[PDB]
């Protein structure tokens, strides 16, 4: 009997991993403050990583990587990319971004230096904040941040996204990545496009149901029109890429996604790996990307505590148990992931 | 990068290497806190003995 505890009740995904384990009849759930666990499914804030790996006779594993927040907060992410040489300011696939503070460190100065070479090029000069707003004018955004309180990010907006017809629509791609205790980086073969349900409005930014593709903000404003829940899965979008553009998902988009995923996670490996440590981590991430009209993939953000889409829970949560958990803790007695590895010689 | 304060001798050497620059109670209060505790003991023992005498 292996033992586990649960410390985030609101986790769609770890709810399902709970049940999947109980139903094996080889795992007992313990009360959440009983320290004699093999597995911690942890809270989201202030997870007490310092208390793990100090129970003799227990190999302990936890479903978060400490220090992974550096990838998973927006402010942090921009800082990481600029400062890390493996990534760099030169980095092709992340939108130009800047970290900006309310006047209640900063790079406001350096924000304007790029703004006013787009008022010296008259070219696309549309940006975006971090409850969020898109403008062309600088002082309408800076005055928005100061009238808010937290640290924010100002980011180039992709004026020229790929648009799905029928609908002249906007979408984003969520891919799910599981990094195990060995630092094997596993991409779930099923991604999902979270779609807009209203024609993309080039010349009017306030009408936000067409610019923001979040699953709620479509629910609470045509929702359901072209596909279920503004959710298009990979078979359909591969088909559409074939019929409409004569390409494939794999070639036009996925190589880039796989490349961005590996790059991000190999960057932070030395800071978060649990290889020689007295407890072991794994963690599920949600990577979100944006695809421009040229078929160039852009990294939007990384989520440390993603929820999955409904159709896919069944399968993804089982995959976590298969590769994250029973690889550490075997039972007696097809792979839904693609392992991300690449040793080029140079 | 920069090595400084190199000090050699027959036993060994020592130095500093810099990769980057920056950016009480009295003998009285004690003897007292010890004696309030001994009082508290003595009282507690007294309460027991008194109880045993009942």
């Amino acid at each position: 009997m292996y033992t586990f505890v649960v410390r985030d009740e609101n986790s769609s995904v770890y709810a399902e991993v709970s049940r999947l384990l109980l139903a094996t009849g080889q795992w007992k759930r313990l009360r959440k403050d009983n320290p004699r666990f093999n597995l911690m499914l942890g809270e989201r804030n202030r997870l007490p990583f310092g208390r793990l790996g100090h129970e003799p006779g227990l190999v302990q594993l936890v479903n978060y990587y400490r220090g992974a927040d550096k990838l998973c907060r927006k402010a942090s992410l921009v800082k990481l990319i600029k400062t890390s040489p493996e990534l760099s300011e030169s980095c092709t696939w992340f939108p130009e971004s800047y970290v900006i503070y309310p006047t209640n460190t900063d790079e406001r100065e350096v924000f304007l230096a790029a703004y006013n070479r787009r008022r010296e090029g008259r070219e696309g000069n549309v940006w975006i904040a971090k409850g969020i707003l898109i403008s062309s004018e600088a002082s309408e955004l800076l005055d928005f941040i100061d009238e808010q309180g937290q640290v924010h990010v100002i980011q180039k907006y992709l004026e020229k996204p790929l648009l799905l017809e029928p609908g002249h629509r906007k979408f984003d791609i969520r891919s799910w990545v599981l990094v195990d205790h060995l630092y094997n980086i596993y991409l779930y073969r099923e991604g999902v496009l979270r779609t807009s349900s209203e024609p993309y409005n080039s010349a009017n930014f306030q009408d936000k149901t067409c610019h923001l593709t979040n699953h709620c903000i479509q629910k609470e404003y045509n929702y359901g029109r072209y596909e279920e829940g503004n959710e298009m899965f990979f078979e359909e979008f591969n088909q559409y890429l074939m019929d409409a553009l004569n390409t494939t998902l794999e070639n036009s988009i996925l190589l880039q996604i796989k490349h961005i995923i590996r790059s991000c996670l190999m960057c932070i490996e030395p800071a978060i790996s649990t290889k020689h440590l007295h407890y072991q981590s794994f963690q599920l991430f949600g990577f979100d990307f944006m695809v421009d009209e040229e078929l160039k993939v852009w990294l939007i953000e990384v989520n440390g505590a993603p929820a999955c889409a409904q159709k896919l829970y069944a399968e993804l949560c089982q995959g976590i148990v298969d590769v994250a958990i029973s690889s550490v803790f075997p039972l007696a007695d097809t792979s839904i992931f693609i392992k991300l590895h690449h040793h080029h010689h140079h | 990068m920069e090595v400084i304060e190199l000090n050699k001798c027959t036993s060994g050497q020592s130095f500093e290497v810099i990769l980057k620059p920056p950016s009480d109670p009295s003998l009285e209060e004690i003897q007292k806190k010890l004696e309030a505790a001994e009082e508290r003991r003595k009282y507690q023992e007294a309460e027991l003995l008194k109880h045993l005498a009942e």
Binding site: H54, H276 | V17, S23, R40
Partner: protein, 439 residues
């Protein structure tokens, strides 16, 4: 030359001390009877080893050490063991009955009846000191005596010797070898009461040591003898600058200046490498790069914790053996690129380095292989607070139900000292968090 007095308190302090003085003797070629051929100035000196040993007309080198335990069994073993002549009986002080794993009984109850004798015995040694710098104090956090009496001793030493420095060697409790369930209570209490009186304390988690001995010395089930020989190697490494010609960490004040910029945050992490079994038939000697790199592995630390997720305020490296600076700087350059090493904004990212060419001496027939070069890193990192959090959570769990509290009240201590000790630790956890993390 400025003398240093060592004080070993409780079973843990005493047994560790034993092992240290054994090691020191071998290191300086001083025999069990206390004779040192290589010392030509008979009857005195102001050599570097004299900081720790004093001399007699008869050619005898005697530790500047006092051992105290509130029961006699353990110290009796010093009194009749291979080093009996080394010490003067006045340096070995024992009581009749111990503190029964009770801070409060060591501090308040039995402390009182023996503090004055200990101070008088300590003064006898200070009176033979031309320019005493202070004290090195060895004890457990978990024992009644080690916790309770040490903290009383430290309060009194601040009174009788205010200008002088006090360093600790403190054994942090681990269930694999612990003997009492109230160790967490004791450890918070003595940390609370000792904090202002201590300039710099080196914690050793028995857990960390026990696993080093399992994993690297292939000792299925390590004893105190196994643990204490390893601890004495680290201790020797740290105090070598006080007993040997050099220019790094030559007086106790310098420990504080090099390792402790913020006084409450005075707990530097020791990491040591390499630890190699003497039974290992075939051994490939490790380089400067290899052992230096190993100082950033948590598995070699004296306290398991993760310096990646915290910041540094100071970092020394103390090498012993065949090491020259060129090799050190090359090792450091490489490492700086391979690892997460983050200092606080108000501090130079930088290392201070001590090399002593004589390689580690090893105890004959012991577990440790003699090696060409070794290193001990002392880094003051905020990561060591992980050990405070561990201990504090255990304390909160029992204290919440007042479990065992009555044993302490019974000895005259007040319930409120518990919550007061713990508020101090909660503040300590906060200081470490201010310094060490950003967002």
């Amino acid at each position: 030359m400025r003398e240093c007095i060592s004080i070993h308190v409780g079973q843990a302090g005493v047994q560790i001390g034993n092992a240290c003085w054994e090691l020191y003797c071998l290191e300086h070629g001083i025999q069990p009877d206390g004779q040192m051929p290589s010392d030509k100035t008979i009857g005195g000196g102001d050599d570097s080893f004299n900081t720790f040993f004093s001399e007699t007309g008869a050619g005898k080198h005697v530790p500047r050490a006092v051992f105290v335990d509130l029961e006699p069994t353990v110290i009796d073993e010093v009194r009749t063991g291979t080093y009996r002549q080394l010490f003067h009986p006045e340096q070995l002080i024992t009581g009749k009955e111990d503190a029964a794993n009770n801070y409060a009984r060591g501090h308040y109850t039995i402390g009182k009846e023996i503090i004055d004798l200990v101070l008088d015995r300590i003064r006898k040694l200070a009176d033979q000191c031309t320019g005493l710098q202070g004290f090195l104090v060895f004890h457990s956090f978990g024992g009644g005596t080690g916790s309770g009496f040490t903290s009383l001793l430290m309060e009194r030493l601040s009174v009788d010797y205010g200008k002088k420095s006090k360093l600790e060697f403190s054994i942090y409790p681990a269930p694999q070898v612990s003997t009492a369930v109230v160790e967490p209570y004791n450890s918070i209490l003595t940390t609370h009461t000792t904090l202002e009186h201590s300039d710099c304390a080196f914690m050793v988690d028995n857990e960390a040591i026990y696993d080093i001995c399992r994993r690297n010395l292939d000792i299925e089930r390590p004893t105190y003898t196994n643990l204490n020989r390893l601890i004495s190697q680290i201790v020797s490494s740290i105090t070598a600058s006080l007993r040997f010609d050099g220019a790094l960490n030559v007086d106790l004040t310098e420990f504080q200046t090099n390792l402790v910029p913020y006084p409450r945050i005075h707990f530097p992490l020791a990491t040591y490498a390499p630890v190699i079994s003497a039974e290992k038939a075939y051994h490939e000697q490790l380089s400067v790069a290899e052992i230096t790199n190993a100082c950033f592995e948590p598995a070699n630390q004296m306290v398991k914790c993760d310096p990646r997720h915290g910041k540094y305020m100071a970092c020394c490296l103390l090498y012993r053996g065949d090491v020259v600076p060129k090799d050190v700087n090359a090792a450091i350059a490489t490492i700086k690129t391979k690892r997460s090493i983050q200092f606080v904004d108000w501090c130079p990212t930088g290392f201070k380095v001590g090399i002593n060419y004589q390689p580690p001496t090893v105890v004959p027939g012991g577990d440790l292989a003699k090696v060409q070069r070794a290193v001990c890193m002392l880094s003051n990192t905020t990561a060591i607070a992980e050990a405070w959090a561990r201990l504090d959570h255990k304390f909160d769990l029992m204290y919440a139900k007042r479990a065992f509290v009555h044993w302490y009240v019974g000895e005259g201590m007040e319930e409120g000292e518990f919550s007061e000790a713990r508020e101090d630790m909660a503040a300590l956890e906060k200081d470490y968090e201010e310094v060490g993390v950003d967002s």
